[PDB]
Design a protein around this ligand. Structure first.
Ligand SMILES: CCCCCCCCCCCCCCCCCC(=O)OC[C@H](COP(=O)([O-])OCC(O)COP(=O)([O-])OC[C@@H](COC(=O)CCCCCCCCCCCCCCCCC)OC(=O)CCCCCCCCCCCCCCCCC)OC(=O)CCCCCCCCCCCCCCCCC
Ligand SMILES: CCCCCCCCCCCCCCCCCC(=O)OC[C@H](COP(=O)([O-])OCC(O)COP(=O)([O-])OC[C@@H](COC(=O)CCCCCCCCCCCCCCCCC)OC(=O)CCCCCCCCCCCCCCCCC)OC(=O)CCCCCCCCCCCCCCCCC
Ligand SMILES: CCCCCCCCCCCCCCCCCC(=O)OC[C@H](COP(=O)([O-])OCC(O)COP(=O)([O-])OC[C@@H](COC(=O)CCCCCCCCCCCCCCCCC)OC(=O)CCCCCCCCCCCCCCCCC)OC(=O)CCCCCCCCCCCCCCCCC
Ligand SMILES: CCCCCCCCCCCCCCCCC[C@@H](O)O[C@H](CO[C@H](O)CCCCCCCCCCCCCCC)COP(=O)(O)OCC[N+](C)(C)C
Ligand SMILES: CCCCCCCCCCCCCCCCC[C@@H](O)O[C@H](CO[C@H](O)CCCCCCCCCCCCCCC)COP(=O)(O)OCC[N+](C)(C)C
Ligand SMILES: CCCCCCCCCCCCCCCCC[C@@H](O)O[C@H](CO[C@H](O)CCCCCCCCCCCCCCC)COP(=O)(O)OCC[N+](C)(C)C
Ligand SMILES: CCCCCCCC/C=C/CCCCCCCC(=O)OC[C@H](COP(=O)(O)OCCN)OC(=O)CCCCCCC/C=C/CCCCCCCC
Ligand SMILES: Nc1ncnc2c1ncn2[C@@H]1O[C@H](COP(=O)(O)OP(=O)(O)O)[C@@H](O)[C@H]1O
Lengths: 121, 347, 42, 53, 459, 107, 320, 56
């Protein structure tokens, strides 16, 4: 799946307009919480490197790190969900438009299938 | 040099890379490569000494030869098809020569010999720039013409790069040579997935660039270029040694660290294409990179080496210049495994 | 050295954080409303 | 990799020099103008793979 | 399952925000409380499993291992409290952080609905153990031991990742439930043979198998007491759990495939039990006894009968507790003697009678005295092997005899006889050490009242 | 040979410190007697009192989710019924053959 | 705005600060000579800044409080023990020499920084130049080994290859018996034990190596005890002479920018004073290093950065 | 003394808060697997006069 050549794709569009039809990630999304945790860890390591009280040196700096991480994570998650939605839409459309390549398998019950039995001895 | 001149040269390097990345005409790509080559030379020679001059002239020779091969490939492609657009290569070994030129530019085996020498000769900042920024343009071109490449040659050079990096890193006591061999092995890992998925190549590039930035900034902060010189860092900045050890473990590909994400994905991708033996061999060979990373970790933070008396004076001073992005680089190169599916963003 | 808390940088940092949070909340509200209107929920 | 700035902005930085049959000065034709015109028209929008076959 | 995971995660900020002289007290109390919380998982069903969510499930094979993993942490903290006395607060906090991370990785490993998540956590457990071994180690060979432990594991496990991603590419899912319900026979093919080898060798190396057991004496001898405890009690059982989980896909190929391993383990238990007879080291002797027990567990898993699986589970739990107790006793001797050689300090029963009683109980439970769960697993595995083949018993017989021998040998060399005249720094045993031994031994004699609680899902 | 025969400036190896000498009733937990005694108390209470006793009682009185008495009663009722009917206890076939469709050989 | 590339780009040029009076000058005297008195009068008369000779705890005077730290936490050596037992078993002699050279390097860096940032000249006692004469005397008397002087030469080359030599070197010349007499008249019991051979080697060393090598790249004023008493003639000689043979006239704005970035960031100035070459007189084991570093950390105002120490009295920590 | 022992004993509250938070998260994750509630062939049951869901 190389989607660079997809027809009707704006070159440098981070989030296309049709992505607005997808549900946005919730503000309490676990991945957003993880990005905020990453920002908090970045703040702690920043305090540790510059030889400052790790937990309580700069509250504004740690808050800025967490907020920026959450912002970028929200937009990145939006783009991720949009790209996966595009992949699924393309796969379903291709399956619909090529019936001969995806035949409907005849439903068969185990009572009429013969599976070889290997005893455990 | 004059800071204005240095800023202008850095902007010229970046503008050459961007010209390579945004242009659709082969001549403009070659011109961007020429611009980057021209503006890179003084950066390698910011600190004037015979070592830096030797490194710069070796780099210039290799890159000029690569540019000449690139132009010959372009001209043969034009001869067999009157096209200048960067597309399918349209021809036999014209593509082979294009691949060889791009491999020499990237430093892939068997054209790996110049990377350790140039990295050892230049300082740590020049080495950082050389090993991080100078990979974007050739990899972008390779990603553009990936459907043209013969998989046999690309995979052969990738496996050679991995093997040579793994073996050559074992014998080094200098940190810059270790970084150069690490770069060679990582490029080998990157180019083995180009025939199958360029997104995985870009993901590996991003992860490797983050790890290399963190490692080089940690090495600059504790200004050591040798294993023993690095062994004295614990007596002043133990937290730096701990962060360095964690980053080295991440670069070794250990889960759950961030550096595990590319190889994993790459292996996964290569299994979708009915390829098993090469992923197995690549993992077993990256074990060597892990071994010499682990030796450096032993010498760095897991053991306390003897110190010197004058070290006491260094206890009384603090670094005047502080790197702002270092904390972020460490976190991104250490703790981004759970965000793996974000690679669908076509990074 | 001998320095006071730089109120300029503190003010800039707090303002940037608050502006980013407010813009994120507004963007989330607009995205929710636009998605509902596009899919015809409410 | 390739960041298609020209298409996004409509700049035409280097597309004028890519093919023989694209607005030569004084309307001087290439030696293979008709063949390249036919090949380009045939392969437009088909894609490289179907285009190649 | 998060009701266990979240407190374990909260253990870290609590430790790092603790007062400089209250870390041990806070850590032990909250670890014991988390262990109590873990006890809820033991009430399993005869039906499928305790599927909490899409990410984590519980099983009566997973529940005893989870309970043991939770219970081990307070014991490790109490054991480590002694030799970390002259150490800075930051490094003690780092040690406790490493122990907490190891527990968290093990807890997530044992639930692990998906095989790739299981592999990721299974290899994530490697880093804290390596750092504990190579940082807070006494001798100069801790670096070589850490290198051996890392590289044996990774050489074994790198093919496993390729095999897993290939299996997901073909089948379409790595989920345990889907794999069990959709299992299909493997044709006897060279590719299938190599897939079987890649799926099995990673768990075989960590048991470890007799051929691949070299890393273990180094890692056990050079690690601190907490490292030895976690290696002998929990980290060795990861291979057995992985084999029991992954063997379902392997059949019917396992029967032909199992012979090289069955022979290696049946001869290696004898070899290692015999090695135990001529040893100059307590820690090496305990390590080789662990190797013998895990070789028997390998035999049980490879036979792959219900009684085999129940015996393997019971033996894993019993061996974990017994080996942790034995290492604790050896460390109590070492902290007084600083030599860690059996023949130097002798006749300790005269000087330390209660500690000699603890030694006797530990050696008896290592000897598999009935009706202890050690012998329950021993006998179930022996009966299953006899049903597999009536000749195996002979080897098993030798093993039992040899085991008893070296066990009592270790009891006789250090506790009986005449005390060395020169050593005079043997102080009376502390309340902490006696509490450690009591907390090690009481769960075994409580579990022998309810064996079904540790007999696995095939009960 | 004017070498000092000393490889480096090193602290002497300290002797082991006894917790009993400076404090009888030392419990082997800490050098501070108050922290010592409280650590002993919390370990004893949260290990022997809470976990070993309450947890053992909880495990002992766990409800029958394994369904052992349920299975016993089911078997009792089933055998009571089968003996009366004259049915031969447990059947050899786990599934009824009428709903299994074998493949005809014709060899 | 701390000095950096941005300041140099915008306004900061140090060529305009030079007003022909900077003239870095170093004065060297033999043991018990009045070099300090002459240098202080030179600084007062010419309007320059005097730098007291760097001691064991010179670095302590510039970091945190000016009060010196403990001997074990700063220097781990004493001059009194060197005088009492110059052939001591623990190698205190070369440790003393190395610490003194490092302190002199720090002092030279600080003087250069002040001269470049303000334009006001400085006056110095024995600098990194001519500090080797004590090394030579200590070697000849048998106080130190040849490995010690090899290590000193390595460190001195690597460090001193980065600085501009002093404009004028002023030497006061005094006889050996006279300086010995001044030594007894001083009254220091430890100083009483200096042998005539040591002073002769040291005195001899200045003439044999220091004058000839610095005469080719500096301007030298050899003075005797009597004529060094009056500083009017000294300042007159300083003002009359003009320096055109050293590296200073060849320097420009960018060289000064590089030198000013060099003298700042003292950590990189002292980078090569701790090179990984293991001499038993100076190498320190892991356990002692850890314990001493922990003790240094437990100092009142040394656990954190200078502005982030609560016990000293720094406020608004949570908002800096 | 209140407001003084808190500054030293505040850490103890963290493990129990994590436990209750984990219980809440387990229930919340459970809430997302209700697609087959009162639909299994083994337990199809008619709702009580004052019952809405068989299990929560
Ligand atoms: C699985 C996911 C879940 C867990 C996540 C895991 C990761 C999480 C954390 C990630 C990183 C962030 C923090 C690290 C920054 C480093 C700072 C530091 O060192 O600590 C000092 C600091 C205390 O010291 P200090 O007084 O400030 O000054 C002393 C100096 O800082 C320093 O003093 P010093 O320099 O004199 O001491 C020297 C020492 C100091 O050197 C260090 O300690 C370096 C720090 C470790 C390196 C970090 C690398 C990056 C992160 C990688 C994590 C790896 C995880 C993957 C598994 C692999 C394991 C390696 O170094 C050495 O001793 C040398 C040898 C060390 C031995 C070998 C090195 C192994 C280190 C690997 C550690 C990995 C786990 C780290 C966990 C956190 C540790 C702080 O610690 C803290 O107080 C911060 C801890 C966290 C704060 C918790 C606050 C939250 C509580 C309130 C909120 C409630 C939460 C719930 C909300 C709702 C409830 C109501
Ligand atoms: C037998 C019935 C008992 C009923 C009453 C309840 C007894 C409960 C005892 C629980 C075990 C003790 C705790 C374990 C560590 C020791 C604790 C301690 O610190 O003691 C200090 C305390 C005062 O010491 P001290 O004078 O200050 O110190 C002197 C020196 O240290 C010098 O010390 P020492 O040389 O005096 O050493 C103490 C003494 C005893 O100390 C020990 O060695 C304790 C461990 C003995 C067993 C070793 C493991 C073998 C596997 C057995 C698994 C049985 C589990 C049953 C459930 C247990 C639930 C907790 O040494 C022995 O007597 C060795 C006994 C070897 C027994 C061999 C036969 C074992 C199988 C017997 C059949 C069991 C099931 C029968 C089922 C069918 C009929 C109902 O001494 C005692 O308390 C001795 C306890 C009496 C001996 C009991 C031996 C049999 C226990 C079998 C387990 C319970 C069976 C319950 C059903 C019985 C029907
Ligand atoms: C994603 C892919 C990333 C590729 C790899 C990243 C490339 C990193 C190289 C960036 C340039 C060199 C650099 O920043 O040093 C590394 C820097 C460490 O700096 P350092 O070693 O402390 O600085 C010493 C300099 O070498 C000593 O330089 P200096 O102090 O003489 O320089 C004066 C300074 C001051 O600049 C000025 O005074 C402005 C003057 C304006 C003149 C206008 C001329 C117009 C024609 O100008 C610069 O530092 C370069 C500015 C270039 C701006 C380009 C936009 O750390 C990083 O850049 C890591 C950043 C993270 C990666 C990139 C950003 C995140 C993505
Ligand atoms: C190592 C961790 C990753 C961190 C990377 C650095 C983070 C800072 C970057 C700051 C924001 C960058 C976004 C750029 C703004 C607009 C981008 C937009 O215009 O470009 C689009 C593309 O968007 C960007 O490519 C997305 C970049 C996002 C990278 C995140 C993925 C990281 C991998 C998973 C690890 C988790 C990291 C989480 C912590 C940051 C259009 O691309 P297109 O012209 O059509 O085709 C070219 C690309 N092709 C050829 C591959 C198809
Ligand atoms: C070192 C410490 C212990 C490490 C672990 C050791 C355990 C791993 C050893 C693997 C066990 C055997 C591997 C393959 C067994 C296949 C069965 C074979 O032995 O029997 C005959 C096979 O004949 C011969 O064995 C052919 C193979 C000969 C080449 C193998 C090398 C023999 C010795 C090498 C041992 C080195 C192992 C370690 C390598 C590093 C049957 O003949 P055939 O009907 O035709 O084949 C049936 C299989 N089919 C159906 C798939 C075709
Ligand atoms: C000091 C000298 C002796 C003094 C004391 C004298 C008194 C001796 C009495 C002590 C033992 C003698 C035998 C008497 C046994 C009577 C009690 C027994 O019957 O109860 C058992 C109950 O014991 C429990 O089943 C076993 C204990 C649980 C073990 C869990 C371990 C505790 C957690 C700690 C951490 C775990 C670490 C190890 C990880 C796996 C068996 O119960 P069960 O027959 O079934 O059915 C009970 C009734 N029902 C039907 C209503 C349910
Ligand atoms: C000591 C461990 C036991 C080692 C026993 C053999 C050692 C000698 C082997 C050395 C490495 C050999 C590398 C190449 C092996 C090739 C096997 C192979 O390709 O099979 C892959 C097979 C089928 O291939 P396809 O082409 O996709 O099928 C289509 C047509 N049917 O698919 C798979 O099962 C993939 C699984 C990966 C195979 C594992 C390869 C490594 C060897 C197995 C592990 C054994 C060594 C373990 C090391 C022990 C150290 C603790
Ligand atoms: N390179 C050196 N090696 C050893 N000792 C030195 C060195 N440089 C200076 N000193 C010591 O500095 C002390 C003071 O110097 P000096 O000029 O003789 O006295 P004063 O400060 O009163 O003028 C002297 O006792 C001398 O030994």
């Amino acid at each position: 799946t190389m989607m660079s050549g997809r027809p009707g794709r704006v070159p440098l569009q981070f989030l296309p307009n049709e992505a607005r039809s997808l549900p946005p990630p919730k503000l309490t999304d676990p991945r957003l919480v993880y990005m905020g945790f990453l920002g908090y860890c970045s703040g702690l390591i920043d305090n540790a490197i510059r030889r400052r009280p790790v937990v309580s040196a700069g509250l504004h700096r740690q808050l800025l790190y967490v907020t920026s991480f959450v912002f970028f994570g929200y937009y990145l998650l939006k783009r991720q969900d949009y790209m996966y939605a595009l992949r699924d839409h393309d796969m379903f459309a291709y399956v619909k438009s090529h019936p001969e390549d995806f035949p409907e398998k005849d439903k068969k019950t185990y009572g009429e299938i013969l599976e070889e039995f290997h005893p455990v001895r | 040099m004059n800071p204005i001149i240095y800023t202008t040269l850095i902007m010229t390097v970046m503008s050459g890379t961007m010209l390579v990345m945004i242009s659709s005409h082969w001549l403009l790509i070659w011109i961007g490569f020429e611009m980057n080559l021209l503006a890179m030379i003084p950066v390698l020679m910011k600190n004037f000494n015979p070592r830096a001059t030797e490194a710069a002239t070796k780099y210039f020779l290799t890159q000029a030869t690569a540019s000449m091969m690139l132009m010959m490939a372009i001209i043969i492609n034009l001869l067999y098809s009157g096209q200048w657009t960067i597309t399918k290569m349209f021809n036999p070994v014209a593509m082979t020569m294009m691949t060889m030129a791009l491999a020499m530019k990237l430093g892939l085996s068997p054209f790996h010999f110049w990377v350790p020498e140039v990295t050892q000769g230049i300082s740590l900042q020049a080495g950082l720039l050389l090993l991080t920024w100078q990979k974007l343009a050739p990899l972008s071109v390779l990603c553009q013409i990936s459907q043209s490449i013969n998989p046999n040659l690309m995979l052969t050079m990738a496996m050679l790069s991995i093997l040579i990096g793994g073996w050559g890193g074992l014998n080094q006591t200098q940190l810059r040579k270790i970084m150069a061999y690490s770069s060679i092995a990582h490029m080998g890992w990157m180019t083995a997935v180009l025939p199958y998925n360029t997104t995985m190549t870009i993901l590996n590039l991003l992860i490797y660039i983050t790890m290399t930035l963190a490692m080089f900034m940690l090495l600059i902060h504790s200004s050591a270029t040798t294993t023993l010189s690095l062994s004295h860092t614990w007596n002043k900045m133990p937290v730096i040694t701990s962060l360095m050890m964690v980053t080295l473990l991440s670069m070794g590909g250990l889960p759950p660290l961030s550096g595990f994400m590319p190889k994993w994905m790459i292996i996964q991708e290569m299994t979708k294409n009915e390829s098993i033996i090469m992923p197995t061999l690549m993992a077993m060979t990256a074990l060597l990179n892990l071994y010499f990373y682990m030796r450096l970790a032993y010498s760095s933070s897991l053991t306390m080496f003897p110190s010197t008396n004058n070290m006491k004076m260094k206890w009384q001073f603090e670094h005047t210049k502080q790197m702002k992005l270092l904390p972020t680089m460490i976190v991104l190169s250490t703790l981004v495994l759970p965000m793996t599916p974000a690679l669908s963003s076509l990074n | 050295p001998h320095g006071s808390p730089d109120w300029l940088k503190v003010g800039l940092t707090l303002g940037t954080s608050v502006f980013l949070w407010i813009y994120l909340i507004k963007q989330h509200k607009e995205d929710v409303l636009e998605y509902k209107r596009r899919n015809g929920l409410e | 990799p390739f960041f298609d700035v020209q298409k996004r902005l409509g700049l035409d930085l280097d597309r004028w020099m890519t093919i023989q049959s694209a607005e030569q000065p004084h309307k001087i034709p290439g030696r293979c103008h008709a063949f390249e015109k036919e090949w380009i028209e045939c392969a437009h929008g088909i894609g490289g793979i179907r285009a190649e076959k | 399952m998060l009701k266990i995971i979240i407190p374990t995660t909260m253990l870290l900020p609590m430790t790092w925000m603790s007062k400089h002289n209250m870390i041990w007290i806070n850590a032990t109390v909250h670890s014991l409380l988390i262990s109590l919380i873990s006890l809820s998982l033991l009430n399993q069903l005869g039906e499928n499993s305790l599927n909490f969510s899409l990410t984590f499930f519980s099983d009566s094979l997973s529940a005893p291992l989870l309970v043991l993993t939770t219970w081990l942490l307070p014991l490790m903290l109490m054991a480590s409290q002694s030799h970390l006395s002259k150490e800075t607060t930051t490094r003690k906090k780092l040690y406790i952080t490493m122990l907490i991370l190891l527990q968290l990785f093990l807890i997530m490993t044992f639930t692990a609905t998906e095989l790739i998540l299981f592999y990721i956590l299974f290899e994530a457990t490697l880093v804290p153990t390596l750092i504990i071994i190579t940082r807070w180690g006494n001798q100069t060979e801790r670096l070589n031991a850490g290198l051996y432990f890392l590289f044996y594991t990774l050489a074994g496990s790198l093919p496993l990742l390729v095999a897993l991603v290939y299996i997901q590419n073909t089948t379409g899912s790595l989920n345990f439930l889907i794999i069990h319900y959709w299992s299909h026979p493997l044709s006897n093919s060279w590719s299938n043979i190599f897939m079987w080898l890649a799926c099995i060798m990673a768990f075989m190396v960590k048991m470890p198998l007799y051929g691949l057991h070299l890393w273990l004496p180094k890692a056990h001898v050079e690690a601190p007491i907490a490292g030895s405890m976690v290696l002998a009690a929990v980290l060795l059982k990861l291979g057995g759990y992985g084999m029991m989980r992954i063997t379902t896909i392997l059949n019917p190929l396992t029967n032909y495939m199992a012979y090289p391993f069955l022979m290696l383990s049946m001869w290696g238990m004898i070899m290692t039990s015999s090695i135990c007879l001529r040893q100059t080291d307590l820690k090496s002797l305990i390590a080789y006894s662990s190797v013998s027990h895990m070789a028997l567990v390998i035999v049980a898993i490879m036979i792959q009968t219900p009684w085999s699986f129940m015996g393997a589970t019971a033996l894993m739990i019993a061996h974990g507790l017994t080996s942790s107790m034995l290492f604790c006793l050896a460390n109590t001797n070492y902290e007084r003697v600083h030599s860690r050689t059996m023949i130097l300090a002798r006749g300790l029963q005269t000087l330390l009678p209660l500690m000699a009683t603890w030694w006797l109980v530990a050696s008896l439970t290592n000897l598999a005295l009935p009706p202890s769960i050690n012998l329950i697993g021993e006998l179930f595995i022996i009966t299953a092997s006899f049903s597999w083949s009536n000749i195996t018993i002979i080897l098993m017989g030798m093993n039992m005899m040899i085991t008893a021998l070296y066990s009592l040998y270790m009891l006789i060399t250090t506790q009986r006889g005449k005390y060395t005249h020169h050593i005079n720094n043997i102080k009376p045993s502390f309340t902490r050490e006696n509490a450690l031994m009591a907390l090690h031994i009481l769960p075994l004699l409580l579990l022998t009242l309810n064996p079904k609680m540790i007999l696995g899902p095939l009960y | 040979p004017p070498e000092p025969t000393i490889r480096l400036q090193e602290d002497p190896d300290p002797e082991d410190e006894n917790l009993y000498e400076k404090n009888p009733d030392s419990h082997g937990y800490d050098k501070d007697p108050i922290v010592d005694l409280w650590n002993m108390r919390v370990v004893f209470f949260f290990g022997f009192s809470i976990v070993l006793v309450l947890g053992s009682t909880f495990v002992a009185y766990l409800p029958d989710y394994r369904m052992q008495e349920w299975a016993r009663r089911e078997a009792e009722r089933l055998v009571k019924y089968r003996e009366a009917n004259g049915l031969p206890l447990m059947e050899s076939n786990c599934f009824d053959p009428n709903k299994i469709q074998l493949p005809e050989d014709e060899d | 705005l701390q000095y950096g590339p941005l300041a140099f780009v915008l306004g900061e040029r140090t060529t305009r600060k030079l007003t022909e009076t900077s003239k870095v000058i170093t004065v060297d005297g033999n043991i018990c000579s009045g070099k300090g008195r002459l240098a202080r009068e030179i600084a007062e008369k010419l309007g320059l800044r005097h730098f007291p000779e760097a001691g064991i705890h010179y670095a302590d005077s510039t970091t945190g409080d000016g009060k010196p730290l403990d001997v074990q936490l700063s220097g781990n050596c004493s001059l009194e023990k060197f005088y009492d037992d110059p052939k001591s078993n623990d190698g205190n002699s070369y440790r003393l020499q190395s610490w003194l050279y490092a302190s002199r390097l720090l002092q030279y860096a600080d003087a250069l920084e002040h001269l470049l940032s303000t334009g006001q000249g400085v006056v110095l006692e024995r600098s990194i130049y001519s500090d080797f004469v004590f090394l030579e005397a200590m070697y000849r008397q048998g106080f130190i080994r040849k490995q010690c002087v090899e290590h000193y030469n390595e460190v001195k080359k690597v460090t001193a290859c980065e600085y501009l030599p002093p404009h004028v070197v002023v030497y006061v010349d005094v006889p050996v018996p006279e300086i010995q007499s001044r030594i007894q008249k001083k009254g220091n019991p430890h100083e009483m034990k200096i042998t005539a051979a040591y002073l002769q080697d040291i005195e001899n060393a200045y003439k044999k190596t220091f004058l000839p090598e610095m005469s080719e790249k500096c301007e030298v004023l050899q003075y005797s005890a009597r004529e060094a008493e009056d500083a009017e003639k000294v300042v007159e000689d300083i003002e009359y002479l003009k320096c055109d043979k050293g590296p200073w006239p060849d320097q420009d704005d960018r060289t000064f920018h590089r030198l000013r970035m060099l003298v700042q960031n003292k950590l990189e100035v002292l980078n090569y004073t701790t090179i990984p070459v293991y001499l038993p007189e100076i190498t320190i084991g892991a356990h002692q290093s850890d314990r001493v570093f922990q003790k240094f950390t437990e100092l009142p105002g040394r656990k954190y950065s200078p502005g982030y120490n609560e016990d000293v009295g720094d406020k608004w920590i949570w908002l800096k | 003394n209140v407001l003084q022992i808190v500054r030293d004993h505040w850490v103890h509250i963290l493990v129990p808060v994590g436990f209750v938070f984990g219980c809440y998260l387990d229930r919340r994750s459970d809430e997302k697997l209700t697609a087959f509630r009162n639909k299994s062939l083994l337990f199809k049951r008619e709702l009580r006069p004052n019952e809405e869901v068989t299990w929560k």
